[PDB]
From a paper:
For the fragment screening campaign, the chosen crystal system was obtained in a citrate condition and hexagonal space group P63, containing two NSP15 monomers in the asymmetric unit arranged in a dihedral symmetry, which can be symmetrically expanded to reveal the full hexameric form of NendoU inside the crystal lattice. Another possible allosteric site for the development of new inhibitors is that identified in the third cluster (cluster 3), which is also a conserved region located at the bottom of the MD, where we found a cavity containing fragments Z2697514548, Z1424343998, Z425449682 and CSC000178569, forming different contacts with residues Arg135 and Lys191. The structure of NendoU in complex with dsRNA reveals that the positive charges of Arg135 and Lys191 side chains are key for positioning long nucleic acids into the active sites of NendoU.
Author numbering:
A (entry chain A), B (entry chain B), C (entry chain B), D (entry chain A), E (entry chain A): -1 to 346
The structure:
């Protein structure tokens, strides 16, 4: 017997939906769910989704509370739907997927991923849940994560980090590095070799390699010398040119991180969703240099150096395809006389 | 085990709350309750109250569906709250009372009227429900209806009509005429002699006496002649004077019914609620005669005639008090040279 | 080049979406679309659906304005979606189907019904639109209407009436009687023999047979005599029994039409949607007789007589199944000593 | 002459309601109050309450702007209502009490606490306001605060801290330590001996005893030695065990404070109201250790040490009742071989 | 062809409105605009204005993204409207002006500032845009900014700082110091000599003169000695008196900044708009000293010292008019025996 009042009972007593039995009285007004405590209304949930408030509330309450892949990964792998859980998109305060399977009666298209409506959809499977590996094997389309080996299935090692209740972390008391597997049209698919973005914040940025410690700590010319980067235009691409009204380059998070220690800036996240490459409308507070569409990626600097050094530098412009978070990221590479002018995530 | 979804199940399957087990999926968007029937949303309920939508939905579902006293009677008797039912106020599309007893967890102030919070409240008790005559005996404050005698109480015989799911009617297959009993601070009251308003509609007005039949058939002058009404200002009070910009008189529903057969008019119900006297801002379409605050009452014409013939006509202006629907209705009586000038429910 | 403002232009200038170029200024406040005409705002559209206001506005604008099958027929045939039109459900003030094909960018699951997401969906195809009979041939699942023969398909002749901009009618200047054809998993179905409900209103009820004329004119006893209906419980089933608190019988629209000429009653439509059988919570004003869940169907009286005379009357109670509007309507038949006691659409 | 526009006049000119006379024009849209400044709308108030926006606005404007007891205290003492002021709950952005006395015409149940409706309610009285001590003496139920001595009334010394416009502080230019007194059913009640929670934030945590300076500054084993805490499981209870997927212990705010210097964590406040014991759904960012329902209290460490040391350690499990903020807080005490396994606020 | 979907296309692809062609599907619900990315809704804009959501969205998208005068300046100069751009008020999340010219069809009063409706309005002109200087010359009323010299027009040097996408900054890669000119009734007006407020935050405060470095760094008595301020009551006016329940003085931002390093405090911005003098309801966290209406201005300390030293100190009270941000700010000057008691922005 699922119900609004039972969902709120679990939220109040168990911090989330926990299969417990019971009911608390609830009031819904506009987009907010409340419950009486000591005779007054206490807010339990503000619906920021495009779903009816009582539906969003239940989905939220039923969010997966184990570490799960970050939404950008699931998106990059073409996931449409999850088997019998909810991947909550903490960046959008909303379900990451439109529909559900076996979760909620207003949004379910199916009780079980074996139902024929699920066969064209890429269904997300969690091998930490009993039976879900088997259900991947039987599904026409899907993405499977496991903590270990699945007999016969060639694994792809995913990122180190996963999301636990909206916190992106590398697990220590829990495991966040998964094997990933994918199936299209009944056929297991080979996951490409790939880099992974690092998912760091600008407020909390911590380097993760001696090279990155050097970038944060050394002056620009020292660092460029020490890692033999002459002619690669990190002055522009990574350090950022703030001298003109249009802010130049500045496409690596670590570069933003360096600048942020010195002076603040505004990042307007005008498409606020999780993705491998982010676009910001950036305004530098110190200089007033700015740019409407500044693509930023958080690659380990080591990885970005390896990508740019591996490039042929003998054409004016070309599109360079790099596989990142399993998706194929296009960059624009502009050169002159065998040195880099600029290299940036291509704006689409 | 009360729940939004169970209430909706009862509505969908039983036309109203009926204590049945079950659940349907529900969605709430702003003030409307919908349910999914075969993949599309069907409107179950639009909240017109000042309560949270899911709360109003449940009180509406749990409305009393037996003939019950009209809200105007309950209010005139000082009823605060009903015992274990909801008197639905179809004139306000809202619960007639703030709080409930033993009905709904969000609005209940008690489960049983015997709890101490109910003692100072005038509680409504329905003798047709097992045990409620008893509970009225224990109750410090209350109003009781019954269909027949109660041993040791003198009854007050109420109106002929009652409200069945919002239709006011004189029951032929069900009883609508109740015995009334009232208790203030543990003492059974002697209810006053009272007239009753008749609760008719302007559109479907039906005479209930030979005098009313004659009023509808005859011409003004004939009717006034037959019933010896010269000098009582019915021309003004009951027929209505449409010759000036201020619509004159027209304070008796039968007079509005008579005019509405010939030519129509606008009645603006600017305090929409059930009350013994109604105030309308009335605009006569044929003539443009209008009045901002036109008090209207539906008295049996014979009872109105009795009231007006029972007054002293020798002072220019005074307040005349008349018990109606158990409440004291003040009238203004204006006279000149021993005849009536006007007589109207006071606009105080 | 679809846009809010272009849709509004079409509404304002063409009464509906018509593919015209142009733009008017629009403003959206909560669920209402307005447009500026000479400096003030005029209401174009109030959203009563569960879709976003601008989305519902566009689907409403793009409604099919040719006579189309009533929604109850489409649902009974299992239609999921329409090919390149919107069947507007005037009973719910909402789109009849969740999704669209080739109509609206927010709701389209495809541009053409031939895309693979449509193959498992039962698609509605209108033979009056060039190419759609063809598309029905390629379609794995579908329902097709036409005005005339289709070479190589046996037709099923549908109802006389269809819905034109929300008015159900039997077309005299346009055709409303369609041939129906259905395909499940690539196989043309043989549609069952079926009766059709007549889709009449209680207010403007018009007899469509000499028996129905007689039913309206004659007294109960005469009519029952003329048509040899003794022992079939029409007194209860069709005339309705208003003598007890439970309103008895009254399951056939013509019986409600007959009563409504004499005295009025409340029909509460608590699941407002188009369906072959309707459930009303009905309160008779003259008598106070009432019933929470009164199933009503509008069958030609002759067809109802044929159904009831085609049953075995020898068991106390059983389920009688009758194809109507192409769907299986269960009835309860109650008999005693070889005569009918009652017979009603099952309240399951 | 109270009015929306007068309330807004005071807000604009006096920062809050100040009995001043005057009016500014106001516009209300959805849940927000605005006023024109220099021809544009400036937001004055966003209603986060379940009250009508214009009502919440007035209550907010009339909030008590003297230091007042924190809402958890008033709750723990059973306060239902305040005499002639509003205790604004800054943590819920809402009135702490449902109704008022002498404040606001939509929410008043009474103009004065002597009215008989107030007698069953525990009314909050402020002896800094003239007459309110006397009104406590006459009230059947109440809680009284004073700055000094009340002849005959045995005092209870309240917490050091009070809330001033939502800032919890120990007063220096103002007095925040009150005498508390309580009355149930006409009878002064003896307030229990009690500890008080410290009301500290995790961002702003300052130790308040040499012991607490030691906890923050020393390593875990040093501190446990220096205060002879071997066998008392502060390793678990206070320091927190982050080694397993379920975060172990961690029920004292100061322990959260220590960890927060090292690494951040997420505290989901899923019942956001003021209370003596808080429940969080906690996710540790460094380790990914987490717990759905982690009870946290902010006792001075000295006080928590005194509580746990005073316990008999010779049973496996028992419920230990401790009086905190005047309410009786249950703890679970789990022991083995005369040492503490775990000791935590009992989850209800 | 302007449209909701075209505006959203520009927002998504260009970070703001950029004249580009194209459309994305959009959904509007309540006050929020969304668009599909990867099958789910992503929030593009939350309407905090009193305009219809789709109108506010377009105005926002069309905001001027060059450095522009801070709204307080435009207000102080009497600007009603901007020529062919939108000055977005980032402090109110709303257009700074009610109407537009040549921007948006719901809010435009004119396509061009030469239209006769614009002649009484003070129109804001931007000489960085071609033709706009000329349009100032022809306008009956206006305010013009330029980066350089305009032949014949006597300039006023504006503030050093301007606002770029809501960041107030002194330009280095861009120019933020403008010449200002004003016209009333066809006649160029002489802008007064004036100080300028510094527009600093309390979190980010940086001194801007050796004097201000001294104020932040030195003790109170040192600083007062070093700059010969004895008898000028900076102890009160600038340092702030926290000893009594009413917080004394404290009207210079730098004084708040000093205190904030030591201890925090609450500033309730109860009229949140940009202005030259701000009013806060201030609560000091350390002492609980507070004040409902504390006027604060951010003058360079040098400038404030120069203002107060220039005053005659020989009257008890007088109104002192100082021109700041071009508007005439009244101060109250209270003296005794030729020393300053208090000096503060006059409360109106
Ligand atoms: C306090 N007295 C009282 O209630 N009396 C009574 C009530 C109901 C029926 C008959 C009775 F006598
Ligand atoms: C799969 N078969 C099929 O569709 N057949 C057919 C369809 C429409 C008209 C005539 C036909 F023969």
């Amino acid at each position: 017997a699922m119900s609004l009042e039972n969902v709120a009972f679990n939220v109040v007593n168990k911090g989330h939906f926990d299969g417990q039995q019971g009911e608390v009285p609830v009031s819904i007004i506009n987009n907010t769910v409340y419950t009486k405590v000591d005779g007054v209304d206490v807010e339990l949930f503000e619906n920021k989704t495009t779903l009816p408030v009582n539906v969003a509330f239940e989905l939220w309450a039923k969010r997966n509370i184990k570490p799960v892949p970050e939404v950008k990964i699931l998106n990059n792998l073409g996931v449409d739907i999850a088997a019998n859980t909810v991947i909550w998109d903490y960046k959008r305060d909303a379900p990451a997927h439109i529909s559900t399977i076996g979760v909620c009666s207003m949004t379910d298209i199916a009780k079980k991923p074996t139902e024929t409506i699920c066969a064209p959809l890429t269904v997300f499977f969690d091998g930490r849940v009993d039976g879900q590996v088997d259900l991947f094997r039987n599904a026409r389309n899907g993405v499977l994560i496991t903590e270990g080996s699945v007999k016969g299935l060639q694994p792809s090692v995913g990122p180190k980090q996963a999301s636990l209740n909206g916190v992106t972390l590398i697990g220590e008391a829990v495991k966040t590095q998964f094997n990933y597997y994918k199936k299209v049209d009944g056929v297991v698919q080979q996951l490409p070799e790939t880099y992974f973005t690092q998912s760091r914040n600008l407020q909390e940025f911590k380097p993760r390699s001696q090279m990155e410690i050097d970038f944060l700590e050394l002056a620009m010319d020292e660092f460029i010398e020490r890692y033999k980067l002459e002619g690669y235009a990190f002055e522009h691409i990574v350090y950022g040119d703030f001298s003109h009204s249009q802010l130049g380059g500045l496409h690596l998070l670590i570069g933003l991180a360096k600048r942020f220690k010195e002076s603040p800036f505004e990042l307007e996240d005008f498409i606020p969703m999780d993705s491998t490459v982010k676009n910001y409308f950036i305004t530098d507070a110190q200089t007033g240099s700015s740019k409407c569409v500044c693509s930023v990626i958080d690659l380990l600097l080591d990885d970005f150096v390896e990508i740019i050094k591996s490039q042929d530098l003998s054409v004016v412009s070309k599109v360079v395809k790099v596989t990142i978070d399993y998706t194929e990221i296009s960059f624009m590479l502009w050169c002159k006389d065998g040195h880099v002018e600029t290299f940036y995530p291509k704006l689409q």
